[PDB]
Design a protein around this ligand. Structure first.
Ligand code: FMN
Length: 148
């Protein structure tokens, strides 16, 4: 049957001691799976963590995200979100990592936008964007506000 959409989002880590990730091959094998699965989204990397924006059938988001925590690469993958939806923000891009090590807060965020075609109501109070920009902004444990 035809079931409504959903947006699951999660974030993990990586090997702080071992070498970098194959963020080219890592996302490639992912898109190939999510595409036919009907899933869509974007991945991120800051040299320590992985942020993924999954948007598709809830039944797929769970299993997928479950396949993720079963991976040996990262480690602390935790469900950041999971909200009901009726539309797809990323139309055409099944999976696409974002080596933030290349961009920055406003930079990386721009990346998403340029290929996100986000035309929803408003990315403002967007539950997903909350996390998305939080990873782009803080990338894990901030230190800008409240000094010593
Ligand atoms: C950090 C990380 C994130 C992943 N994210 C996804 C994902 O969002 N969707 C997906 O279908 N597979 C995902 N995968 C799984 C890979 O796409 C792929 O299955 C893996 O690189 C090895 O596949 P193989 O055992 O079939 O060779 C992820 C793997 C890693 C290490």
């Amino acid at each position: 049957g035809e079931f409504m959409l959903t947006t699951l989002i999660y974030r993990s880590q990586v090997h702080p001691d071992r070498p970098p990730v194959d963020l080219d091959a890592l996302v490639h094998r992912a898109s190939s799976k999510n595409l036919p699965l009907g899933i869509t989204g974007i991945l991120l990397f800051n040299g320590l963590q992985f942020f993924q924006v999954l948007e598709g059938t809830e039944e797929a988001l769970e299993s997928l995200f479950s396949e993720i925590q079963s991976d040996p690469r990262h480690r602390d993958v935790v469900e950041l979100m999971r909200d009901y939806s009726a539309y797809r923000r990323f139309h055409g891009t099944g999976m696409r990592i974002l080596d933030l090590r290349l961009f920055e807060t406003d930079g990386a965020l721009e990346e998403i936008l340029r290929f996100s075609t986000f035309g929803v109501t408003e990315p403002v109070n967007d539950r997903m964007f909350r996390l998305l920009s939080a990873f782009i902004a803080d990338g894990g444990r901030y230190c800008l506000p409240e000094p010593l």
